[PDB]
Structures are given as C-alpha cells and as structure tokens.
Amino acid sequence: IWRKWHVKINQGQKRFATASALAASAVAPLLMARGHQVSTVPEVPLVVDSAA
Amino acid sequence: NGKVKAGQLWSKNKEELTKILGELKTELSQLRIQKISSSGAKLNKIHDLRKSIARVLTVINAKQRAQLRLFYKNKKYLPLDLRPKLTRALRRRLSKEDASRVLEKTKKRLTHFPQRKYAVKA
Amino acid sequence: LSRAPKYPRKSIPHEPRLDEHKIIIHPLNTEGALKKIEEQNTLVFIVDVKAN
C-alpha cells in the first residue's frame, strides 16, 4: 500500500494548464478535432444570458 | 383440534391452564403410540399439540412472572432472574446519582460562577 | 446459623424435569416384543435414557 499513488504537481503548472485548456476551448477547429458536434453552434465561445 | 390460540389462553388463570396442559400432554402421549402403530394425517395433530403445550407453558410462565414483579415492586432485593440483565459491566457501573455527586466547594463555585451565555460584537 | 435470605435467588421453582409423559416415549412394536406379550405377560417400552 505504500506505493506512490498520488502525484504532487506545482500549482503554477496547474494554473498554466488550466489557462491553456481555457484558451483551447475558444478555438472552434479544436472542438471539432476533439469530437464535439458544434456545427450548429452560433458562436464560440458560446455565452448564454444569465436571465435564462 | 389440538391448536390452542394464545388469545383464549391469556384470559385463563392458573388452574384451567394447568388442566389444559394436562389434557394436551395426554393427547400427545396417546398420539405418539398412534404414530408408531399407524401412519396418517395425525402427525399434523402431534405437531399442533407440541406447539399448544409450548404456548400454555409460555402463558403460565408469563403470568407467574408478572405476579412476582407486582409482589417485588416495592422491595429492596429482587430475585436475580427478575433483576434487569443489561451487561455485567453495566451492572457494575456507578449509578447516575453517585456519578453526578459533586463536592460542596464545587457546588458553591458552580452556583455563583456557572458557564454564562455570551456573544462578542464584530 | 442457617441461611435466612432477604430474597430468593430463583423466583420460580422448576417444574419436574422428568414427568411420566417424558419418561414413556412409545411401546415397541417389534416381533420380539410381540412374542413377549403372550409368552411372558410382558410389555416392552422405549423410555427416556435418564429414567430408572
């Protein structure tokens, strides 16, 4: 049980990776290359009104 | 026949319950000989007689114990079977009054300085 | 001094452990017992092992 199961990652690198993934989410070719069906989506990034 | 319900037994007293126990035991004793001499549907009757004897013994014991608890209601020493069981450690545990007894100096301190209810302004 | 207890240790006395209905179980129906009936005026019973 004392195998190393958990991985310590720098918080700065975690924040870097999260920011890169957020930037990649705004690129419509990357959404299709990841396999999302977004051909009828009116705009990327898609922002819906908070009143809805 | 041979099936005695508990509801009719709960209203009887000791003498008719003893009489019923005697008749049931006699019928079971005869019916065992009937079993070893011939085969029939009387095995159902021997099973019901056994359970009826068990019910009568249960009711007699329960009424006797209830009467004894009434007799020992206001006495300091009870029979060991009538005393509550709990566990051995629970029976050896200090009583609630003895465990809650405090010294008089402690009582004076608690009377004049108990834990107060307070709030602190933010 | 003899004991003069302030409480009985057992509240209810036991019923007799070996009464007649427990002593006599059933008669024996074997051919040896059936011989003994008219040969010796003897009945054969199966009884409790603890009865004298």
Next chain:
Amino acid sequence: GALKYLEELSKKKQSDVVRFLLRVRCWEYRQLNVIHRASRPSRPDKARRLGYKAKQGYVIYRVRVRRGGRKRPVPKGATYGKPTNQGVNQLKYQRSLRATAEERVGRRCSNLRVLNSYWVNQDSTYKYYEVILVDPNHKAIRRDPRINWICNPVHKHRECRGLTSTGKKSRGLNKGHRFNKTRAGRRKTWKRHNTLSLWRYR
C-alpha cells in the same frame, strides 16, 4: 494535631525510641503471616498523607517481600548463549519490591483496589510494607466524590500496570530533559520514533 509530631519523629529513624519500635515490630511481623491484614495503620500520619481514611471501605494489609536482586530461572543458574561477563547474582528487577508487595496484596484481595503503600520495616531478608486498599463496591466509597473515581473500571489493578506511585517512579514519568525517553511511555515513544511516515503528496 499530633500528626505533625508523628512526621517529625518518623524522620528520626536512627534514634533510640524509633529503633526500639522498629526492632520489636520487625520481630512481630516476622512471626506473623507473609501477607496478613492490619487492624489499623501502624504509621497513621503516613497512611493519612497517602490517602487512607478511617472510613468503612479502607483496609490495610501488611506484606513482607524477600529483598535483594533477581535470579533468571535457567537450569543450574547458567545460560547457553554468548558470554555475558556477569552472573544472575547481579541481575536487577526493573520494578520495586514495593510494587511486588502491592501486586501480591492485590492478588490476595482481588475485590479491592490498591490505592498506595508505604515502607514500615526491613531486615536482612525482608522488606515490610503496608498497603492501603479501597472497596469500590462499598456504598460509602461510591457516594464520595474524592474517592469514587477508583470505582471506575479503568482503575482495575493499577498496581499491575504501574499506575501507583512506585509504578510511576519506575516508569520514569517525570517532566524534562532527564526523562526524554520515558515521560510519555518508553515503548510508545520508541514506536513513534521508529515509525516511517509517508504522506500522499510526498
């Protein structure tokens, strides 16, 4: 009271009066049984400061124990291993003779609780002690908040576990740098220092 005078007199164990009393009492206790009940404490000031009361539920038992060291029960008093440069004549028991006296008295009175004990005499063969015991099942004990802590089951056989005064001394339960290895429990401290601790995010 008189107990202050008794304490100051008990300090003077080499005075003529105290040596006379010690000699005659040593003879009497040697004639009595190895473990026997005392009708009252022979040192009332000592018993009172150790916690004895003249109350139903407090008893005193006097016990003598053979003094000196300890012998290992090996055949012919010799071992069959590596050389030790010593004999069993110089082996020292890690508990006190007072603790041995308390344990034997507790076994004689298994229904009671050992509160404390005190030295009363010694000669070349024996050391003599008086042990204070409390009846946890007595109503006068159970109703008293100064003593009914001993009726709780966590204090069963304190003398067997070293929870009496001599037991605390032998376990070395004192504060500070001289007692680094023993103050929280020697074996527990050893286990804490020899435990390998591995966290998730190491």
Next chain:
RNA sequence: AGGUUGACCUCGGAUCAGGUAGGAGGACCCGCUGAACUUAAGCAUAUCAAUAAGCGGAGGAAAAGAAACCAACAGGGAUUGCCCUAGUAACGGCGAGUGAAGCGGCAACAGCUCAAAUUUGAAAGCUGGCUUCGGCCCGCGUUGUAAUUUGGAGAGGAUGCUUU
C-alpha cells in the same frame, strides 16, 4: 458476689445479611521478562533490538497530564499528536552503524482534589436494618467522619457594594 461482674484490644467461627474476583478477547494500550538468525572478513563491545517468543493488567480508546518544565529571551507556560527541528547535537571495536531535545507552525484545548490547622458553643459525617416513608434503631468513627484551605494561594482583620 470481688476466685465476682464487666470495659477494651487482638485473633477466630458461621451454607450468618449483602456484595465482589476469576474465564474469554487481546488489532490498538500499560508494564514485566527477554533471544537468535542477521550486520560487523571471522568475532566475546556493538548491530539485529531495549524487537520475536513467554508472563501479568485495562478500555473504547489506553496512556500522559495541569511543571521540583523549558529556558537564558523583550522570556515562554499541563498533556497528546502532525510538520519542522534533523540524519542535527551526541554515542561508536579493528567501524559497521546509531541518534534525541528546546524553540517555531498547526490539530485540540480544561481544569482541579487531598495530607499537613481545634467544629470544640456542641461528629455538624457515614454503611446497614426496620419502617406507618415522618423517622426510629444496630453500629462505624475522636488512633478523626463533615465544613474550611492547597501555594494561582490562603488564615485573620478592615470595608462597602454585588451574587444565588
């Protein structure tokens, strides 16, 4: 009656009235006792190890614990545990090796009881028995049961407000 009649002390008896202990379990806990394989070329210091086996004793936790502490500072302030101190100070044949603590951050926090004093204008205390549940008895106990005090103080004074 005094060769008697008693008071105590100590020591016994009882299938005496009422209770209690034992065995189990033992992962964890408190003690006692205690190896060798191993590692040191071998090997009697050492190491394995204050470990395994053996023995006694608890609980839901145990143990520890309100300083005869740490410190040497502008001082901290019961106990326990985690991180750190630190593989450090230190110990060690022919060297293999061994190895804490104070401070600091945090989890959690909680404080108290006796002995030593004459209530002495009143043993004010308590087990048990019987109760009509009001109490009354047999006793324990002055070789000291209550109240009061525990070092942070306290006792005696003074003083005027608060408290239940």
